[PDB]
Design a protein around this ligand. Structure first.
Ligand code: HEM
Ligand SMILES: CCCCCCCCCCCCCCCCCCCC(=O)O
Length: 424
């Protein structure tokens, strides 16, 4: 019957086309097919209906019609999320375990991550002054490894931090093939196993009473948690989900690199981060909206869904267009311009600013760490804008929108770092 016909990016499998157009694939198809919703096949002939905008996001997060079970590509589960991770469960089991993740996001725990971040950048100033150049992508990922492990209650000796950061970096990057085979797949599984082994030891030692992580940290709460049926997570699964509490915190290094990129590109933002109290928040929010990170999210239609003039058939894949929604003309005035001032009148909808998911924290798969992400970016941008001066030598600053994942090609390099001190 009874709806209009669902247009298609025709082909048995368009994975290579998706990979070559990257974050602009869905926009290109919508413009080429002149439509707001279309079907494409990928990952070996699997049909996906691409939905976007607020309506797309509110439908994608309707648990009565959309299923997330088994839709993350297996290789991404094996490298990025981990087997049996929170991302891979649905229903009461998911709601129960998600409440554990959300219980970490207290006012005091959020204030703690803010202070850790501020202290570590302040302490890092001398080191960056001594370096001839500083790759911000790499320097922030090492610093955030120190922040994240400590916030999670996980003991990481300083001699192991560079190793851990590198292993996290590999796992975070491992969605690049969208679940297809790729050269660094085994290196990614090996990195994950090293980190999993390390965390599982900490959980076991916590449960044995050999170490005593502080109450309220991820290590403590996860090791002692029981699900709604009375059963604790087995040690390996516990280690996996414990990693889910701070690996993505370490992934904030992507947004730190982007934030300095934005500051360099919009020079006046530096002064306003210094002088306007709310501005650091708005700049952080506009970095998350504007720069590419998560391209889209996979789901599956549980039943026929009537959506934007078409019928989405039961059993077809669904792809929530993350990049397309955060750059949706009709949601954001001049969406391809960096404009932190737009967040002066953003009404806080759960369904437009979705760079880390949409919907409800407690009953949807929406990112648990959005507050931490904003807090860490606020403090990091405040540091770079206010506590130090530096030079940006010319280098490859391109963010290739046709290449997933989004990166500044150089990683954003700075030189001539010097503390700002009033010694008068
Ligand atoms: C650094 C940038 C970050 C990005 C781009 C990001 C993005 C995402 C996305 C797209 C999802 C999936 C949403 C869905 O499936 O509907 C997700 C889930 C999740 N994120 Fe993040 N996130 C980030 C930071 C964080 C941080 C800092 C934490 C923890 C402190 C975190 C913890 C999680 C968890 C636990 C989930 C799974 C929740 C569930 O399945 O119910 N993330 N994130
Ligand atoms: C056109 C649609 C094609 C459909 C293919 C669906 C393939 C799904 C790819 C999903 C990519 C997930 C990216 C998640 C990034 C996670 C944020 C980093 C934080 C972390 O370490 O967890």
């Amino acid at each position: 019957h009874h709806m209009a016909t669902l247009k298609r990016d025709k082909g048995l499998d368009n994975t290579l086309k998706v990979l070559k157009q990257g974050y602009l694939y869905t926009t290109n198809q919508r413009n080429r097919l002149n439509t707001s919703v279309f079907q494409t096949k990928a990952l070996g002939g699997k049909p996906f209906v691409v939905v976007t905008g607020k309506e797309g996001a509110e439908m994608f997060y309707n648990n009565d019609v959309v299923q997330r079970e088994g839709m993350l590509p297996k290789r991404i589960v094996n490298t990025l999320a981990g087997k049996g991770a929170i991302h891979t469960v649905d229903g009461k089991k998911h709601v129960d375990r998600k409440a554990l993740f959300m219980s970490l996001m207290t006012e005091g725990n959020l204030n703690y991550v803010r202070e850790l971040t501020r202290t570590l950048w302040h302490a890092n100033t001398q080191r960056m002054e001594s370096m001839d150049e500083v790759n911000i992508y790499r320097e922030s990922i090492v610093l955030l490894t120190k922040v994240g492990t400590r916030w999670a209650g996980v003991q990481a000796p300083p001699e192991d931090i560079e190793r851990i950061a590198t292993d996290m970096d590999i796992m975070i990057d491992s969605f690049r093939a969208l679940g297809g085979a790729f050269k660094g797949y085994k290196a990614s599984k090996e990195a994950r196993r090293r980190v999993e082994d390390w965390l599982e030891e900490q959980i076991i030692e916590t449960r044995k009473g050999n170490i005593h992580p502080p109450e309220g940290t991820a290590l403590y709460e996860f090791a002692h948690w029981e699900d709604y049926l009375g059963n604790p997570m087995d040690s390996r699964t516990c280690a996996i989900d414990l990693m889910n509490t701070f690996r993505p915190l370490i992934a904030i290094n992507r947004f730190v690199s982007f934030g300095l990129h934005a500051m360099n590109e919009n020079p006046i933002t530096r002064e306003k981060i210094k002088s306007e109290p709310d501005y650091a928040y708005k700049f952080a929010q506009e970095v998350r909206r504007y720069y590419p990170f998560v391209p889209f999210l996979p789901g599956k239609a549980k039943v026929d869904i009537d959506f934007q003039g078409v019928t989405i058939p039961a059993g077809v894949g669904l792809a929530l267009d993350v990049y397309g929604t955060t750059h949706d003309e009709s949601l954001w005035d001049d969406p391809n311009e960096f404009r932190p001032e737009r967040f002066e009148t953003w009404d806080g909808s759960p369904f437009d600013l979705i760079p880390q998911g949409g919907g409800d924290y407690w009953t949807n798969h929406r990112c648990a760490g959005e507050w931490i992400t904003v807090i860490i970016m606020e403090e990091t941008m405040k540091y770079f804008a206010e506590k130090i001066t530096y030079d940006v030598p010319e280098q490859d600053l391109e963010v290739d929108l046709n290449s997933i994942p989004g990166y500044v090609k150089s990683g954003f390099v700075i030189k001539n770092v010097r503390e700002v001190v009033d010694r008068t």
